[PDB]
Amino acid sequence: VHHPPSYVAHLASDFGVRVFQQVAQASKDRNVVFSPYGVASVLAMLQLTTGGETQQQIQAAMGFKIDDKGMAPALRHLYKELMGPWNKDEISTTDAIFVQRDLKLVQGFMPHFFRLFRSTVKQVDFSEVERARFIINDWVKTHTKGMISNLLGKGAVDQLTRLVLVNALYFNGQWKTPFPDSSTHRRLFHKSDGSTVSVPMMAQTNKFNYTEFTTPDGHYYDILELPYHGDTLSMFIAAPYEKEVPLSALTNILSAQLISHWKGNMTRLPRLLVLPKFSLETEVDLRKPLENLGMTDMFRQFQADFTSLSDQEPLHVAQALQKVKIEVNESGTVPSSSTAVIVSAR
Amino acid sequence: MAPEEIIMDRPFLFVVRHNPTGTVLFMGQVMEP
Numbered sequence: 338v339h340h341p342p343s344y345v346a347h348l349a350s351d352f353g354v355r356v357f358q359q360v361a362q363a364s365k366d367r368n369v370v371f372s373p374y375g376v377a378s379v380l381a382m383l384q385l386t387t388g389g390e391t392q393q394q395i396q397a398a399m400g401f402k403i404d405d406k407g408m409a410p411a412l413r414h415l416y417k418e419l420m421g422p423w424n425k426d427e428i429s430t431t432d433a434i435f436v437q438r439d440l441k442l443v444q445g446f447m448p449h450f451f452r453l454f455r456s457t458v459k460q461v462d463f464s465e466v467e468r469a470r471f472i473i474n475d476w477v478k479t480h481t482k483g484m485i486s487n488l489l490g491k492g493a494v495d496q497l498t499r500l501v502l503v504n505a506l507y508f509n510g511q512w513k514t515p516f517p518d519s520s521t522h523r524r525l526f527h528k529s530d531g532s533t534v535s536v537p538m539m540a541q542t543n544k545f546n547y548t549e550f551t552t553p554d555g556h557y558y559d560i561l562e563l564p565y566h567g568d569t570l571s572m573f574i575a576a577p578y579e580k581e582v583p584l585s586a587l588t589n590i591l592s593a594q595l596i597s598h599w600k601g602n603m604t605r606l607p608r609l610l611v612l613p614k615f616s617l618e619t620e621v622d623l624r625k626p627l628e629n630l631g632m633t634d635m636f637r638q639f640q641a642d643f644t645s646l647s648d649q650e651p652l653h654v655a656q657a658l659q660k661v662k663i664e665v666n667e668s669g670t671v672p673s674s675s676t677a678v679i680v681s682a683r
Numbered sequence: 684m685a686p687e688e689i690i691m692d693r694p695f696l697f698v699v700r701h702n703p704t705g706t707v708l709f710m711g712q713v714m715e716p
Contacts, residue, residue: 576695
């Protein structure tokens with residue numbers, strides 16, 4: 338039997354890589370930095386708060402139950418292996434749940450939730466509106482180390498708000514062979530509409546793990562791996578050979594498996610890599626993307642089952658979102674995402 | 684005197700992951716830097 342965390346790792350990512358696909362097909366011509374792992378973390382938490390058909394849809398979509406045998410302990414060993422000093426490159430994931438103190442939780446929920454996830458649990462009074470988001474937005478701030486200063490916009494939560502499960506991912510990697518400053522020069526970037534632009538690109542002559550991958554249509558794509566000095570983490574680059582063929586054709590067949598396959602067929606070949614440096618920042622609404630994967634109920638009122646959490650009143654996800662941010666330069670990559678689900682707050 | 688040059692002048696894709704566990708941490712679609 339395969340290493341437990343490596344199995345749960347796959348399913349979590351796979352789900353995430355399928356959510357990205359919905360976000361990408363919705364954002365066809367715009368920049369999108371997403372966190373597959375980030376969405377998986379909060380949905381796993383949500384699996385406990387929900388019930389009935391609502392809970393079943395999430396488990397069907399994700400591909401596993403956070404309840405089953407050895408499942409939760411494996412997700413916890415994953416948190417650990419990811420944040421171990423042995424990786425050289427720093428990672429920091431943290432989950433939290435904010436519940437209305439006067440919300441009569443069903444029996445056993447609190448201790449059980451903690452036994453499985455063992456994360457931050459905060460009891461806050463949402464009637465004190467501004468103070469509430471000050472509690473969460475500041476939580477996100479410290480756990481993403483400054484990045485993502487204001488996850489929740491004014492009025493994103495309110496008095497009617499009951500539950501807020503959020504995740505805070507951080508990564509600070511450093512290229513195993515950083516790009517030479519001197520090599521940075523302006524080059525032309527051909528946009529998805531035809532126009533070109535002068536963008537500072539980074540260059541580097543070395544031997545990279547490269548592999549050519551053909552698409553069902555017959556299109557060839559380049560897949561390249563640039564590791565970080567920990568040799569446990571790396572960024573994969575995938576662009577087409579021809580400029581006529583769009584990134585769409587590549588992203589539409591994406592899967593956590595296809596990524597494993599690339600990594601498996603690679604061979605260290607000498608190449609002169611010229612990559613444009615960049616600093617993106619995006620906020621995605623996970624509502625539509627989630628429903629496209631089967632989880633419709635949690636958004637529909639009088640349909641959403643949250644009977645595992647409370648039952649003094651019916652509940653449902655008023656909104657779901659993910660704010661990511663990534664800085665790529667000559668030395669490394671410092672991406673950080675903060676994904677949150679909000680129940681009773683539009 | 685130079686090996687095959689690979690330029691990322693068109694919109695590309697990028698996936699940062701933890702190899703041992705196969706954890707896709709972040710994903711990206713860079714359409715315009």
